[PDB]
Design a protein around this ligand. Structure first.
Ligand SMILES: [Cl-]
Lengths: 332, 332
C-alpha cells in the first residue's frame, strides 16, 4: 500500500519539493497541464529523468568554457556541453545527475536573467580536477540550443545543449576547450530586482525527455505542483511573508514521495485509471489529493489556478484507491 | 517504537549523514569518544544544537564585512559576528540555522586551509536584501575567537564568534560595518592539494553548546560516526575510489534518524543505560548497532578505529532494547 508515501509531515513543513528542495507550503493547480521527468518517479519504480532523488552536486567533466573579449577581469563565464554526453551518469546520459530540468534564459552584458535556475559553483580543470578558483560565481543552468553565439531555450532534451553561465562577473574569466563544471544542486531563482515573480518554473519552461508522460486534467480533477518558498537572487534574504513579496518554486512531487517511489514498486497497489487518494484535513474543512500511476498528483479544483495555502493543514489520512474519473473532494 | 528509524535504505546508499548530507557508506568507530549537538536529536525530542534536520541555507543579517590583507589579484572577504547573535533562529540563538559545528581553520594569502568546512555564497546588503554580487565565492565557515585581527579556533559556543572567510579571491571586496552572510548549507571539505585527508571533522574540531552530552565507550561498546564520501576543494571531481584517495566526511547521526527523532518523542521507548539495537546483516556475517537515549550510535568494536565498510550490507533488522553494558555482537 502506498499510504505511507504521504504522511502529515510531508506537507506540514518537513517535506520538500523534488525540484528546488524547498519546504512545501502550498499546492499549485495547473489547469493547463504539465510534464515532469527529472527527479520524478512513477508507481512502477521508474523515472524518465536523469537525476536521483537527492540534492547534492552537479558534476560534468567535459564542456567548453569561455568569456567574451580581451579583458579577463569581471566577466560573464560561459560553460556548455551537449545533452546526452553525461557518460558518467548511471541513471541517464542526458545530463549530469542534478542538472535542473529548466530551459535556459539567455543574457549578456550587465543583464541578470529573469526566472533562471541558479546554483553556486564554478569551472574546474578536466586534466587534474583542480578548481579554476577565479571562476566561482552564481551560475544559471538550463537546456538550450544555439550555444555559444545565440543560446535559446528548448524544452526537449533531444538535440539540446546543457548550459551554465555566471549571472555576475567572475574574478577572472577562463577560456578552455575542455573544462569541468561543478555546481551545488540546491538552486535559487534569478531575479533582476527585489520583486518576486510568478511560481517557477512555469509549465512551458520545464525540460522533458522523449517518452515522458504528460499530466493533463481528468474531468474536474487537475494536476498540481508542490509550491515551496525559494530564495531569489534579487533579494537573497527574503523568506516567507512581509518582505517584498513571497517567491514560490514548484516541483512535481514531494521529495519524500519520490524517495519512497524510487525504493519500491507499487504496481500491485494501483491500476491505471486509478488515483491513490489521501484526505488532507485542515483546521476548517478538508480536501483530497490523488496520485496517478504516472506519479502525478491531482486536486478536484477544475479550472482554478489559485494556489492552495497549506498553513492550516492539520493532518493527512489515507483514503485508498479511487477512480481517477471521480472528482476529488474540495471542501475548503 | 524507534525500530523504523533505522531501516535498510538508511545505511545501504539512500540515507545521508547529518553534518555533510553525504550518502553514508561506512561506520567510523571513535574509541577516543566525541560530542555532537548540531543537527543532532535525542530520544526526548530535543536538540542542544542550533540547526533543523535539513540542509538549506545559512543566513545571518548582521555581521561585520571586510577584506584586510588583500591584494588586487587576491581579496579574501571576511565576515564575522558573535555567537549568540542569531536572534532570528527559533531553535537556538547561538548561530544561524545550518552553520557548521566546526572550529575555524585560519589561513592567509593563497594558502588553502586543511579540513575546513567550505560552502558557497557571499555577503549581502542588510538594508535591502540585495547580494553583494562581487563577493560570491567559496567560504570557510567556523567558530573562532579573536576576529578580526587574529581569528583562532574554538570548540565552545560560549564567548565565541562565527566566522566566514573566502578561501579564494572574490571579484571585489566589500567593507560594511553591518552586512549579511548567505551560504548554502551543503558543504565541502577544504584541501590544499588533490590528496584526501583524514575523515572530517576529527573529534577535536567539533563545536558544542553547553550541556551537550558526550559519547564515551561503555565497556566494549564504542560510539561511532557515520562516514560519507564528501567533495574536497583540491580535487572537486573526486568521488568514491579516486586514485587521489577517497575523502570521508563524518556525522553523528543518519539524517533520516535525526528527522524521525525531531518529529516524535521516544522517551517511553528507551531508558538511560539502554541501547535500542538493530542487527546489520552483511553478505558474510553480521553486527549489531546500538542507539542510546542521547541519540548516539555504538558498535561493539572496542579500541578499534578502523572504518567499517557498508558496501556489503544486505539488510537491517530491529532487535530491541538491550543493556548498554552488554557487548554488541560484531561478527564480520
Ligand atoms: Cl537562522
Amino acid at each position: 500500500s502506498p499510504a505511507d508515501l504521504l504522511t502529515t509531515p510531508v506537507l506540514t513543513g518537513v517535506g520538500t519539493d523534488n525540484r528546488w528542495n524547498g519546504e512545501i507550503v502550498g499546492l499549485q493547480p495547473v489547469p493547463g497541464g504539465f510534464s515532469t521527468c527529472n527527479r520524478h518517479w512513477n508507481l512502477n519504480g521508474s523515472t524518465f529523468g536523469w537525476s536521483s532523488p537527492r540534492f547534492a552536486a552537479i558534476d560534468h567533466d567535459r564542456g567548453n568554457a569561455s568569456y567574451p573579449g580581451s579583458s579577463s577581469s569581471n566577466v560573464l563565464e560561459l560553460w556548455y556541453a551537449s545533452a546526452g554526453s553525461a557518460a558518467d551518469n548511471p541513471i541517464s546520459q542526458i545530463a549530469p545527475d542534478g542538472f535542473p530540468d529548466m530551459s535556459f534564459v539567455p543574457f549578456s552584458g550587465t543583464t541578470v536573467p529573469t526566472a533562471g535556475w541558479v546554483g553556486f559553483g564554478g569551472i574546474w580543470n578536466s586534466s587534474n580536477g583542480a578548481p579554476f578558483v577565479t571562476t566561482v560565481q552564481a551560475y544559471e543552468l538550463g537546456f538550450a540550443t544555439g550555444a555559444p553565439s545565440n543560446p535559446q531555450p528548448t524544452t526537449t532534451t533531444s538535440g539540446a545543449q546543457i548550459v551554465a553561465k555566471s549571472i555576475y562577473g567572475v574574478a577572472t574569466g577562463i577560456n578552455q576547450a575542455t573544462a569541468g563544471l561543478f555546481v551545488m544542486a540546491s538552486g535559487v531563482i534569478s531575479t533582476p530586482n527585489s520583486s518576486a515573480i510568478t511560481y517557477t518554473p512555469q509549465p512551458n519552461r520545464i525540460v522533458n525527455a522523449p517518452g515522458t508522460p504528460a499530466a493533463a486534467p481528468i474531468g474536474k480533477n487537475t494536476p498540481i505542483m508542490f509550491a515551496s518558498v525559494v530564495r531569489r537572487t534579487g533579494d537573497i534574504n527574503a523568506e516567507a511573508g512581509s518582505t517584498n513579496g513571497t517567491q514560490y518554486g514548484a516541483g512535481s512531487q514531494p521529495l519524500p514521495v519520490t524517495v519512497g517511489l524510487s525504493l519500491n514498486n507499487y504496481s500491485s497497489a494501483l491500476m491505471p485509471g486509478q488515483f491513490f487518494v489521501w484526505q488532507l484535513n485542515f483546521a476548517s474543512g478538508f480536501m483530497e489529493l490523488g496520485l496517478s500511476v504516472d506519479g502525478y498528483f491531482y486536486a478536484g479544483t477544475g479550472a482554478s489556478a489559485t494556489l492552495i495555502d497549506l498553513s492550516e493543514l492539520v493532518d493527512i489520512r489515507p483514503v485508498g484507491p479511487r477512480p481517477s474519473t471521480s472528482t476529488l473532494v474540495y471542501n475548503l
